[PDB]
């Protein structure tokens, strides 16, 4: 492995990206509820970064 | 007519085959109603001081 590989892995895996809502308009079949997608891609513990 | 991929022959895969394109609103989230009519409301915020 090279250092650049480590930098690429950290830059890629350790980030919080964007996820849209589920059931949002325009839908031909209306949904009773609209649900927003949540995610946690930023690791917080040293065991996760390892 | 945007070409996503060119097949092994001279046949072009295009957005029309895989998607439907139309001129729509940026967001369908909100709506403005006046009385029983449909009207876009213009909210004006006063500048400080």
From TrEMBL, chain A:
Q: List where in the cell it is found.
A: Cell inner membrane
The UniProt entry's sequence similarity note says: Belongs to the resistance-nodulation-cell division (RND) (TC 2.A.6) family.
Residues of the signal peptide: none
What protein name applies here?
Answer: CmeB
Chain segments annotated as coiled-coil in the UniProt record:
none
Superkingdom is: Bacteria
């Amino acid at each position: 492995v090279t250092a650049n590989d480590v930098i690429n892995a950290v830059n890629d895996q350790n980030a919080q990206y964007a996820t849209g809502k589920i059931g949002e308009e325009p839908v031909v079949n209306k949904s009773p509820q609209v649900i927003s997608i949540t995610m946690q891609g930023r690791l917080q513990t040293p065991q996760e970064f390892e | 007519n945007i070409i996503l991929r060119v097949n092994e022959d001279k046949s072009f895969l295009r957005i029309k085959d895989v998607a439907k394109v139309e001129i729509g609103a940026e967001q369908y989230n909100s709506t403005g109603r006046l009385n029983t009519s449909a009207a876009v409301p213009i909210i004006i915020n006063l500048q400080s001081g």
